[PDB]
Design an enzyme around this catalytic site. Sequence first.
Site, PDB file in Angstrom:
ATOM      1  N   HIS A 122       5.965  50.294  12.824  1.00  0.00           N
ATOM      2  CA  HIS A 122       5.305  51.256  11.935  1.00  0.00           C
ATOM      3  C   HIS A 122       5.203  52.698  12.413  1.00  0.00           C
ATOM      4  O   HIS A 122       5.036  53.605  11.599  1.00  0.00           O
ATOM      5  CB  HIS A 122       3.885  50.789  11.602  1.00  0.00           C
ATOM      6  N   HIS A 159       5.242  42.543   7.393  1.00  0.00           N
ATOM      7  CA  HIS A 159       5.099  43.915   6.908  1.00  0.00           C
ATOM      8  C   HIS A 159       6.406  44.706   6.839  1.00  0.00           C
ATOM      9  O   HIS A 159       7.334  44.463   7.612  1.00  0.00           O
ATOM     10  CB  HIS A 159       4.088  44.670   7.800  1.00  0.00           C
ATOM     11  N   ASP A 246       3.895  36.972  11.887  1.00  0.00           N
ATOM     12  CA  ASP A 246       2.769  36.957  10.956  1.00  0.00           C
ATOM     13  C   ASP A 246       3.122  36.409   9.571  1.00  0.00           C
ATOM     14  O   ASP A 246       2.326  36.476   8.630  1.00  0.00           O
ATOM     15  CB  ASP A 246       2.083  38.339  10.855  1.00  0.00           C
ATOM     16  N   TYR A 285      -0.760  36.956  14.542  1.00  0.00           N
ATOM     17  CA  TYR A 285      -2.161  36.945  14.913  1.00  0.00           C
ATOM     18  C   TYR A 285      -2.830  35.597  15.149  1.00  0.00           C
ATOM     19  O   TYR A 285      -4.021  35.545  15.451  1.00  0.00           O
ATOM     20  CB  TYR A 285      -2.919  37.793  13.894  1.00  0.00           C
TER      21      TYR A 285
END
Length: 357
Positions: A122, A159, A246, A285
């Site tokens: 990111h 993501h 994730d 996570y």
Amino acid sequence: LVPVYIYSPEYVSMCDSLAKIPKRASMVHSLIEAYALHKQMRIVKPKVASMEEMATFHTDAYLQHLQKVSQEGEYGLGYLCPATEGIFDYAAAIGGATITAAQCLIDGMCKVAINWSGGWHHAKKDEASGFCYLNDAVLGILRLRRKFERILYVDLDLHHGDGVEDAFSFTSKVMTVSLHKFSPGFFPGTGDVSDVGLGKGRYYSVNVPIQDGIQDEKYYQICESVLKEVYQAFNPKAVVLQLGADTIAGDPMCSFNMTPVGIGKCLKYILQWQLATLILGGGGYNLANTARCWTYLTGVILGKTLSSEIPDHEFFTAYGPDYVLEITPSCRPDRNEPHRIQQILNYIKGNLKHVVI
Ligand SMILES: CN(C)c1ccc(C(=O)NCCCCCCC(=O)NO)cc1
Ligand SMILES: [K+]
Ligand SMILES: [K+]
Ligand SMILES: [Zn+2]
């Protein structure tokens, strides 16, 4: 020949301090070692990235500010990227680790290099974002460009890999492909199928927006479809693969419903191209499940079948109560309508027709 495994006691101790994934680095390394996989790889100590190496992507202003605040504990250092003490050092360690993996690939030391603690996709040139203070993936891609003419970046994290896509949005030398959840209010908000890059880079960015509940079969069908077209049109000379866990069932992100087997099929498809491949981690996570995933994927890379029973080791109790390597899908519904997925794949197929080397 044998895969390069980026590791050192100091590196793991550093990564273990990351506030969002405490001790995850040790858990991953520990399980890999318990399966004795390190004995089949070439262990390489990562170097720490220098200010100028980081500056091949990030602005001096940003790096100098990062360093300053890291000393005391308008560059995105807000809620998701708080300026904690030593963050500059942790970032330089991870950036350096990915750069080192890239260098091993260029030197022909191996065909596959692994940095499970990397994959901070990111971060922007002058802005921290989504827990990422430095974009190691961009740094690795830039290093690979010294040897390989065209680089393919594939991002399977839950993501959107916006930082990497943005870094290369205007060029055709690097194609970015991201499969991710795309829904209102879901971070970072970008990456609809219509996002294809800009200017000379138009059509050199590929995005597959996916909804909650996707499972292994459909996910691999999508990934194989896209990568087959990408390989044929782009003819990459090297690959950087981000495998954030994730997406795996059991993750607190509660979005996708994948297992390591599904991601493993995607990985195998890429490995059969026999190109220099830089492997990175990313989100994940549910720590034990992330270790289960990456350990299984390391086995795939080594072409080994691992025992279902988790071997006794430092974090054994974290794998209770069943203590097995396999992850069972949840009973959450798959919100992906076959027709929409088909539309998405066809849109992408059409976009790639514009790519000609
Ligand atoms: C009400 N309130 C104070 C908040 C509500 C939502 C968020 C959020 O979504 N944050 C983004 C989560 C970060 C996603 C990055 C995870 C990853 O692995 N990326 O690769 C934050 C605060
Ligand atoms: K992704
Ligand atoms: K691009
Ligand atoms: Zn993620």
